[PDB]
Amino acid sequence: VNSFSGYLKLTDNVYIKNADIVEEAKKVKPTVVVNAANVYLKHGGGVAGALNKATNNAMQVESDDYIATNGPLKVGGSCVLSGHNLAKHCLHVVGPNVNKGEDIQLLKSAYENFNQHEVLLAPLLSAGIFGADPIHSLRVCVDTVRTNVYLAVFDKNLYDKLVSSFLE
Numbered sequence: 001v002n003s004f005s006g007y008l009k010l011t012d013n014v015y016i017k018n019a020d021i022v023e024e025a026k027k028v029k030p031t032v033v034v035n036a037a038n039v040y041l042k043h044g045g046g047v048a049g050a051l052n053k054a055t056n057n058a059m060q061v062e063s064d065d066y067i068a069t070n071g072p073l074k075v076g077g078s079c080v081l082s083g084h085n086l087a088k089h090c091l092h093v094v095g096p097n098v099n100k101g102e103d104i105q106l107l108k109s110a111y112e113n114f115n116q117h118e119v120l121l122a123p124l125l126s127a128g129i130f131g132a133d134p135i136h137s138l139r140v141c142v143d144t145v146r147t148n149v150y151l152a153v154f155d156k157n158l159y160d161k162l163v164s165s166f167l168e
């Protein structure tokens with residue numbers, strides 16, 4: 001369906017909204033929802049824990065079966081798995097955790113995965129406890145992604161800061 005509403009249009013293909021990605025997935029029923037994943041697909045906190053709990057742990061069980069047979073992802077990589085009751089597919093993307101010393105250069109690689117999908121509902125990669133500068137993450141998104149991306153940022157102060165910084 002991909003019926004997104006209430007988003008600010010930043011560029012011809014990048015949109016942003018102050019919202020919880022889980023509530024947006026429930027409302028929109030998107031073709032693809034992006035998970036802010038880690039390499040072993042352990043969906044404990046942040047975006048990942050919220051998406052997993054909304055699937056009543058079906059996402060974690062599926063992720064564990066994937067890791068058992070294929071091993072961990074690489075930083076900057078991704079994996080398409082089921083979207084369960086939230087979306088047709090979930091694109092698990094691993095952005096660098098610069099609070100754990102991972103290279104910020106891999107954030108462009110992480111966003112490049114979005115280009116395989118015409119339209120996506122996504123979080124701001126490597127933000128929050130992953131510790132990348134969120135303004136930098138938004139700029140990398142705008143410069144790298146060519147497909148339609150709807151960013152849901154669940155923090156009004158951060159949303160307002162990103163919008164002000166971009167409108168400069």
Ligand SMILES: CC(C)[C@H](Nc1ncnc2[nH]c(-c3cnn(C)c3C#N)cc12)c1ccc2c(n1)OCCO2
Pocket residue numbers: 019020021022036045046047050123124125126127128129130152153154155158
């Ligand atoms: C920068 C943050 C505002 C952003 N978080 C979010 N962005 C968008 N929709 C979100 N829903 C929730 C949510 C719903 N219920 N609960 C209990 C939570 C939690 N926690 C968080 C969330 C962000 C984005 C990238 C992340 C990350 N966090 O954490 C590390 C890895 O990469």
